[PDB]
């Protein structure tokens, strides 16, 4: 019912090759859906197109627009206070704030900061490691309180402990909202029988779409998924 | 000399070295480490597989 694009044709340059062609996408209302594929197959491109960052050569995007929470593939913070950019111009709520941070497991990483929570980081402030940047980028979208939250490879600079913690706590909290759709792409298929909808693609073109009763259509692709046990 | 975010890929190594918060813990071959069940590497490969 929610965001859908039938037979979309998207590109980066209006003169180059139409990078994305003939795609058909569905995102249910208040569910957990993932997108997967090979490296550079076009898994972020479909998303940025469905965010309005690509002149569609053809097709039709349908929404409900909305202030969609987002986290770019490379994490990006603000030249401001850690509190100031995790909040991001939202009405500060101690409960929601501390809950989101505990979900992102940042408290021990905040404690090492010289001013703790109000440490002035950025391109002008003190610099730090990519794991913390990624966690802050995720926290920004988690505290965002938007209907359609939306992530892009959050589990990149995260190890298994922190990845498990984030996934479990944060994503189960998102699902705990009566209606809050979150769309995270990742490379670890480990958490497939935790996603409510699956979208696989190769070389841009989508292949299939469906969680369980559709992952039984062929053994080649599902064996490729279960190649890593 | 590999650093691994995927303990399943490092599996084919000749010798695996495990790191606690600042020191090696019993560098050895992967087979013995996973078989011991006392290695943290066992917990890794079992929580990831
Ligand atoms: N900002 C950009 N400008 C121009 N071309 C791009 C840009 N981003 C991606 N492309 C091209 O579009 C294709 C799809 O890129 P995309 O970012 O979707 O890769 P991806 O599969 O999402 O990345 P990854 O595999 O690392 O998750 C790539 O072949 C790339 O060459
Ligand atoms: Mg990408």
UniProtKB/Swiss-Prot annotation, chain A:
Domain ABC transporter residue range list: 3-228
**Residues given in the record as ATP binding sites:** 12, 40, 44-45
Which residues does Mg(2+) bind? 44, 73
Q: How does it assemble?
A: Forms an heterooctamer with KCNJ11; four ABCC8/SUR1 molecules interact with one KCNJ11 homotetramer.
What is its biological role?
A: Regulator subunit of pancreatic ATP-sensitive potassium channel (KATP), playing a major role in the regulation of insulin release. In pancreatic cells, it forms KATP channels with KCNJ11; KCNJ11 forms the channel pore while ABCC8 is required for activation and regulation.
Q: Which family does it belong to?
A: Belongs to the ABC transporter superfamily. ABCC family. Conjugate transporter (TC 3.A.1.208) subfamily.
Name listed for the protein in its UniProt record: ATP-binding cassette sub-family C member 8
Species lineage: Eukaryota, Metazoa, Chordata, Craniata, Vertebrata
């Amino acid at each position: 019912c929610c965001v859908q694009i039938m037979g979309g044709y998207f590109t980066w340059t209006p003169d180059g090759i139409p990078t994305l062609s003939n795609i058909t996408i569905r995102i249910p209302r208040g569910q957990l859906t993932m997108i997967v594929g090979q490296v550079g197959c076009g898994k972020s491109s479909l998303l940025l197109a469905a965010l309005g960052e690509m002149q569609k050569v053809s097709g039709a995007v349908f929404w409900s627009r909305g202030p969609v929470a987002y986290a770019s593939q490379k994490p990006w913070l603000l030249n401001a206070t850690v509190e100031e950019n995790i909040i991001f111009e939202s009405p500060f709520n101690k409960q929601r704030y501390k809950m989101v941070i505990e979900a992102c497991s940042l408290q021990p990483d905040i404690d090492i900061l010289p001013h703790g929570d109000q440490t002035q980081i950025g391109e002008r402030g003190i610099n730090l490691s990519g794991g913390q940047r990624q966690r802050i980028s995720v926290a920004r979208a988690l505290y965002q309180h938007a209907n359609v939250v939306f992530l892009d490879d959050p589990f990149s600079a995260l190890d298994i402990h922190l990845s498990d913690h984030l996934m479990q706590a944060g994503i189960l909290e998102l699902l705990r909202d009566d209606k809050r759709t979150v769309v995270l792409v990742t490379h670890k298929l480990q958490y497939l029988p935790h996603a409510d909808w699956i979208i696989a693609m190769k070389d841009g073109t989508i292949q299939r779409e469906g969680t369980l009763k559709d992952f039984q259509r062929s053994e080649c692709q599902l064996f490729e998924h279960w190649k890593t046990l | 000399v590999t650093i691994a975010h995927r303990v399943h890929t490092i599996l084919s190594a000749d010798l695996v070295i495990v790191l606690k918060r600042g020191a090696i813990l019993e560098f050895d071959k992967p087979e013995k480490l996973l078989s011991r069940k006392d290695s943290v590497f066992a917990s890794f490969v079992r929580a990831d597989k």
